[PDB]
Design a protein around this ligand. Structure first.
Ligand SMILES: CN[C@@H]1CCc2c(ccc(O)c2O)[C@H]1O
Length: 281
């Protein structure tokens, strides 16, 4: 009396994510005015979110709704690697989108030298290859297996499929994928806010007859609320045993996946993007 209802909501999530991603990608592709050296990162983020929505959510929904995996043992390592790759790529793309804006605000005269047409391609290939180095390599070669008697059968059994990681690969992946982008964002956005406050003070002193707080607050809060608890609990259950159950872990993992849907709404707000979206329909 409850399986039917949840499926509708999860399918709506899938539809919203895919619709937003496709709309952003086609808006960037069709119109020449939107092409900019700082818009390639948006394209990469949209592609990563679309890959997440197309190859991550449906399999998880099928696994959750149905009793058993009902697929081969080979596909589980592919699915987990795809999830890890997509999450890491999204996080690092967000970090780059923060870094280039910090460079633009801090030093405007030399902003042209730092970012060029070829630089975006190089940085995107580098960031994606770093994301893929930690996804396929340590999973496809079975470097993350655990020594516990529990889940040894799960590795052996083709029907069972759930995440069980060693002590290293959990903390190492968390450090690589979450904490460094968070620190970089915090520092650069604090500096940007300081510069904006100084400029506002100067103009208010010049003209003898806020607003950035809302933007910075939403930008930081969406990401933090979406991705903070999952990595904390990921660290803790490996640090100590019997700390959590599995249902809470799965629920936090699923609620972390909704971030990719909100990013197109959060990021594209310029009048040019609105005019383009109007021109689509
Ligand atoms: C079960 N899904 C995976 C499992 C572990 C993991 C995820 C995301 C980023 C990481 O760095 C991870 O180690 C999750 O999306």
């Amino acid at each position: 009396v409850w399986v039917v209802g949840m499926g509708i909501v999860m399918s709506l999530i899938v539809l919203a994510i895919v619709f937003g991603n496709v709309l952003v990608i086609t808006a960037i592709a069709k119109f020449e005015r939107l092409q900019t050296v700082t818009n390639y990162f948006i394209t990469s983020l949209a592609c990563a979110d679309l890959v997440m929505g197309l190859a991550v959510v449906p399999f998880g929904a099928a696994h959750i709704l149905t009793k058993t995996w009902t697929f081969g043992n080979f596909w589980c390592e592919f699915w987990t690697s795809i999830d890890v790759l997509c999450v890491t790529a999204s996080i690092e793309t967000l970090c780059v989108i923060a870094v280039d804006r910090y460079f633009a605000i801090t030093s405007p005269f030399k902003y042209q030298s730092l970012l060029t047409k070829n630089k975006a391609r190089v940085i995107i290939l580098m960031v994606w290859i770093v994301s893929g180095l930690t996804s396929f390599l340590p999973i496809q070669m079975h470097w993350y297996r655990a020594t516990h008697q529990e889940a040894i059968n799960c590795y052996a059994e083709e029907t069972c499929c759930d995440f069980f990681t060693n002590q290293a690969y959990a903390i190492a992946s968390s450090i690589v994928s979450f904490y460094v982008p968070l620190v970089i964002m915090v520092f650069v956005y604090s500096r940007v806010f300081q510069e904006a406050k100084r400029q506002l003070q100067k103009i208010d002193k010049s003209e003898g007859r806020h607003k950035a707080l809302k933007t910075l607050g939403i930008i930081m809060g969406t990401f933090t609320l979406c991705w903070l608890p999952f990595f904390i609990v990921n660290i803790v259950h490996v640090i100590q045993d019997n700390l959590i159950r599995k249902e809470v872990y799965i629920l936090l993992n699923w609620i972390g996946y909704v971030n990719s849907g909100f990013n197109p709404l959060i990021y594209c707000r310029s009048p040019d993007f609105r005019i383009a979206f109007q021109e689509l329909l």
